[PDB]
Design a protein around this ligand. Sequence first.
Ligand SMILES: Nc1ncnc2c1ncn2[C@@H]1O[C@H](COP(=O)(O)OP(=O)(O)OP(=O)(O)O)[C@@H](O)[C@H]1O
Ligand SMILES: Nc1ncnc2c1ncn2[C@@H]1O[C@H](COP(=O)(O)OP(=O)(O)OP(=O)(O)O)[C@@H](O)[C@H]1O
Ligand SMILES: [Mg+2]
Ligand SMILES: [Mg+2]
Lengths: 459, 494, 106
Amino acid sequence: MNVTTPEVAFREYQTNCLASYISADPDITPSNLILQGYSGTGKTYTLKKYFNANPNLHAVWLEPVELVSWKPLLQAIARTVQYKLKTLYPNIPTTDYDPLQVEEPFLLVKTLHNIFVQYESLQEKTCLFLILDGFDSLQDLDAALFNKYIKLNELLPKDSKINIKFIYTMLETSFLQRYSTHCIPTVMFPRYNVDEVSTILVMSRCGELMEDSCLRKRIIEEQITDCTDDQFQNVAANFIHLIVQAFHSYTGNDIFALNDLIDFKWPKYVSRITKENIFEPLALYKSAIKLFLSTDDNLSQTYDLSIISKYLLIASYICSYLEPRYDASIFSRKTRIIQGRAAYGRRKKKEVNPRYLQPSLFAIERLLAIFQAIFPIQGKAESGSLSALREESLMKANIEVFQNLSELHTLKLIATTMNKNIDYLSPKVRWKVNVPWEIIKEISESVHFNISDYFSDIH
Amino acid sequence: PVIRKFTKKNVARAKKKYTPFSKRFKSIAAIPDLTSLPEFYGNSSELMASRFENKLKTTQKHQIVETIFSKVKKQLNSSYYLPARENEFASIYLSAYSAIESDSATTIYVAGTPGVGKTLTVREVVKELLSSSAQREIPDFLYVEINGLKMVKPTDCYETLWNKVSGERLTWAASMESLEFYFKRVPKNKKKTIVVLLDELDAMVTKSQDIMYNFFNWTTYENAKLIVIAVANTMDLPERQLGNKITSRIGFTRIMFTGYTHEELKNIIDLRLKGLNDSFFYVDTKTGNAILIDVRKVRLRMSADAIEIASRKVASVSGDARRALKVCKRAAEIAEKHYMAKHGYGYDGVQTVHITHVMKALNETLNSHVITFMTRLSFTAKLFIYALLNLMKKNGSQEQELGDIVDEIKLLIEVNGSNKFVMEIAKTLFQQGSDNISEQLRIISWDFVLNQLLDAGILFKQTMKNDRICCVKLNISVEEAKRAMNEDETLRNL
Amino acid sequence: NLNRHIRMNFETFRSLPTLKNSIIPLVATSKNFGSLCTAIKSCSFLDIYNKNQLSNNLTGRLQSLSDLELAILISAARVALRAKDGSFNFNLAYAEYEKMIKAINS
Ligand SMILES: Nc1ncnc2c1ncn2[C@@H]1O[C@H](COP(=O)(O)OP(=O)(O)OP(=O)(O)O)[C@@H](O)[C@H]1O
Ligand SMILES: Nc1ncnc2c1ncn2[C@@H]1O[C@H](COP(=O)(O)OP(=O)(O)OP(=O)(O)O)[C@@H](O)[C@H]1O
Ligand SMILES: [Mg+2]
Ligand SMILES: [Mg+2]
């Protein structure tokens, strides 16, 4: 059958494969076939490109990326099949069944059989195509699904004036190798390379970012009447060359992240281009090298909280990365009175820097003690005859610390043994924290506290 | 305006009542006689029994072909006198006759292995009891078949009991209550004796035996008359599910049927064959049809020594007449098809079967095709099982991971860099000979054979994600694994 | 070559339908008699078929990646070999990676 080939730039192998696989007559098409690939390769884009190349053939489209289970696919398919049938055969009579009536593949095949028997008076046999984009991307997927969908053409009677076909698309290929014994035809799209992705981008996003507003914005913000579409395309092309030369090591052969980053960082580069910068783009790149050297694509201060919240979270990081016995030397300030000896501390240096380690457990009284020790100074005294006689200048176990600590657990910064039916009160509960080193570091200099010396000496 | 949070439209509600019989007369003096009632005691099920007879009738005939053995197969079939098991007949029929004479509520329980003819003997006993009912001297009573396996829900016993003793439809919770009412609150003068047969109780009451508890509660009345029997396989059930106190208070009688002896088996199977045993037939010259007392007059026979051996081998294990009869039928089938192949008639003066062929039919049941298949596989599976056995010999672990077995495989291959078989299967397995193909850590087809052996059952895989540390087990044996190993000329020497 | 592939089916899989799948594309893409004859003679397009069939299973995916991936994978692998169960984390691999770069620049 005459099939117009889509003259694609990079997927002509799969184009040939599928153009040979599929045509109008169902006799020369396989019973079941798969079209697997990886994200960014435009497998879905090329499917519709081939459909554009072949208008007479038609197919239904479903996106189970949004659907969650099997029955939603059942209802969607039951709706779409008859919707397409009646839309593409206006003159045919019908008794439209309820698509919601389906709740099981048995019911689905029953209603399709009803559809076919009411469509028994067709002039020639016709096979349609079905599409399930991301069938492995389901959210409650199990391993007993694909074979059942493969088994649709069997239970169908062979005298059907209207038949159907299946299409698929996977990402991992692990579940694909989990089921390959049935010898299914398959076409694959390998992940692209440097020049392939570069050309793909400079022919896909070229127009999109050429007809963007920011170009015209800058062209009259600079007010320079020396331009042409050729030079616009050249400057965009070399800027994309710079983008890829900078961030190929970061990602490699992907398009989605590159497009997102381009959308984020294009305006800053456009805000810098000028006459001298277009006449000599190396200096322009030197002037916009900062985003290339640092993406910094997120968002002085970091908090607007109280003081004890800031200062108590500081203690917990210490109480799970420091040995319980190697702390009495540095965390004591009283003057001894009665006879007694201290320890020798850490005789042996550690070479692992427990920053790299999963933290330990502890009881809360440890936190109480260490926080009492490290708390800043308050309750100013005067050295008077009675000033310090009763002041007791040191924070004690009030209620506010209890409440702000209880707040932290709902803030999910202090982590306890994960439990449904949690119980903050128990003798046996262990506690921990979920914060990296940077979270704790950001507090230190902001509040003018210093604990880096406790960690910087061991390793 | 309102939206139903979840819909149920495929539901198939059953049109059955909730009101028990106890609330349509409202007084003890307001109840009529159920005996003088046309709807009660099942006088309407006949129309339903006969209504579906014509749904599958046709009259297509074209060149009918009939042969010698099929009539003997039918004569030997299970769809039909027996003196072998008769003492139990004389005992249980005597007990039932005395029970119906006494008009009491007697209980009896029986069991047996499948194939002891328990159902056959009980059916014949109740048929002779039907004949005694045709004596018109004993009080009439009605049978009740109970097949919970053919039933879906175990509580539907009450539903069907009511729908067959009255034709009325209800749900279990009302039918069983109305039946309690019909049993203990109803006097004797008009109620009818009923006999009931329970079958294969081992799966009816899996949950808590509440249903059979209710039954055995019914079977403990003096104003109500019933004849209750049950069938099972195990023997401890009455005291296991109920306990000791209930089973002792009821005080029933216990019995079980054991496998028959070889002599009785042969006597019975030949009893189902005396009509055709050593018969002479007029046989046509084209179709070979055997007609009984261009045509011969030949004789038919079968190996009595084969009867002896076939009954002897199977009487010592279970005593399953079904097994014996199917063995005889398949021996007849093989003989018949071999004879047909001798001439080759197509499709549109002595005849006898031999000990050789009777044993041929009898022994292939125990001869397992697994050995031949597993010896007839490719080299890969045999090599991998041999490596598993090598690890078993090395560590005595009874278990092996995937990484360790793959390590053993690579060691076993690379150690034998000299053997000719491994030499000649060397390079066509990783990258398939030619260039332009990069090496792969694993061989080709390893996952294929792995899933093949998983689907075969010899391999057991635990639920894990890691492709390496996933534990693996073999299912059959190491000895049979050798009995597959050493028959490969290359494996024996390595 | 076709008899060699017959041998290959005989010794690898021992099942016909996979071979049916492999042969279908040849005639499927066949256009004219001369190309048919030459392609079934040299069977060089079976080379492309079996090259692109299992291309992206274990090797090609590792062939297409950045050197940072290789460096961090080496950092993880060495510490796993040093370890008992081979367990590893983000910052352990980072530490070994920085040690690698320090030695390289030293
Ligand atoms: N040969 C090509 N020609 C033109 N555009 C291409 C080509 N290959 C890939 N692309 C681009 O790649 C983009 C990939 O996005 P697409 O929505 O098709 O995802 P995908 O690769 O199918 O992944 P997933 O199914 O996981 O979403 C397509 O929008 C298309 O613009
Ligand atoms: N004495 C006998 N006379 C005739 N046939 C017999 C005799 N003993 C056993 N059989 C045959 O053996 C078959 C075994 O059937 P049986 O009554 O034992 O079934 P069952 O134990 O109720 O079955 P299941 O366990 O499958 O429910 C009988 O149908 C009958 O064909
Ligand atoms: Mg996509
Ligand atoms: Mg039975």
